[PDB]
């Protein structure tokens, strides 16, 4: 950071933002890796049995980033708009 | 020339800001400019910076 | 009775000389008071900066009464 004695960038530009503590337990899955669970149910716990999701994660939203493949049931898990369509295309269903 | 403030006559302060000589004209200004929020032009009153 | 204190030398002058292709936003003359004037497609900014408003090539004609040195851009 030292620039010979002038004000360096880490003291001359303003601080900005806060870090959300709400997003520490948040995580994202995508439709490419939804078929890696076992038993045709994608839960919060089943996403932890396969190593797709850490522990201390308790809020999962799944986006669309590939192909689903198997008919899976997503309970208690938010999905996006383009991902809910690609799951229900492949025989999926949603409840909570 | 000391800084002033031009507030709306509502519960909304859009607050365009400028300055003037108050050492010439000891009363206020009632000249009215454009508002982005309320979207009606309004009696832009005194600064009253405190 | 004490000298010093020159200023910081504003980089004026004819940028983008008189046969060059232009795009339609280019600063064409930096200028301290319209030594050059505005021709066909050029703009005359607030500090008398000439700027191209269309594409083409800049011409630098001399035209008219008063001996105006013009800067015009011809779409060629």
């Amino acid at each position: 950071g030292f620039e010979g004695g002038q004000q360096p960038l880490h003291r001359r530009l303003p601080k900005f933002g806060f870090v959300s503590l709400k997003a520490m337990d948040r995580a994202e899955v995508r439709t490419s890796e939804l078929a890696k669970v076992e038993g045709d149910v994608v839960s919060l716990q089943t996403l932890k049995d396969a190593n797709l999701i850490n522990q201390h994660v308790q809020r999962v939203k799944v986006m669309l980033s590939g192909e689903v493949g198997r008919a899976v049931t997503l309970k208690g898990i938010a999905a996006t708009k383009g991902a809910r369509a690609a799951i229900e295309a492949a025989g999926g269903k949603f409840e909570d | 020339r000391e800084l002033i403030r031009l507030v709306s006559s509502a519960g909304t302060g859009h607050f365009y800001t400028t300055d003037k000589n108050k050492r010439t004209k000891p009363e206020k200004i009632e000249i009215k400019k454009y508002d982005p929020v309320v979207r009606q032009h309004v009696i832009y009153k005194e600064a009253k910076i405190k | 009775t004490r000298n010093g204190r020159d200023s910081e030398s504003k980089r004026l002058g004819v940028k983008l000389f008189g046969g060059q292709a232009v795009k339609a936003g280019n600063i064409l003359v930096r200028l301290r008071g319209t030594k050059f004037h505005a021709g066909y497609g050029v703009g005359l900014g607030k500090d008398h900066t000439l700027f191209a408003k269309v594409d083409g090539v800049v011409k630098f004609e001399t035209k008219g009464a008063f001996g105006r040195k013009y800067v015009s851009i011809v779409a060629a």
């Binding site: 950071g1 360096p8 960038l9 880490h10 001359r12 303003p14 601080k15 900005f16 | 800001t17 300055d19 | -």
Partner: protein, 63 residues
């Protein structure tokens, strides 16, 4: 962790996949003096210049 980032640099430079983004200076406490065109063009979150990336991500411990 056996390498400490500047805490004071992580306040300034948030990292995205497009680079290290930062806010602008000259946007504090003297604002009736400057024009609205100069308060409008500094209000966003710019990116970090190429000559500045090496000094910052040595402070933010990433080199």
């Amino acid at each position: 962790p056996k390498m400490k980032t500047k805490s004071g640099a992580a306040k300034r430079f948030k990292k995205t996949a497009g680079g290290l983004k930062h806010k602008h200076a000259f946007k504090s406490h003297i604002l009736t003096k400057m024009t609205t065109k100069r308060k409008r063009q500094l209000r966003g979150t710019s990116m970090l210049n190429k000559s500045d990336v090496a000094r910052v991500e040595r402070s933010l411990r990433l080199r």
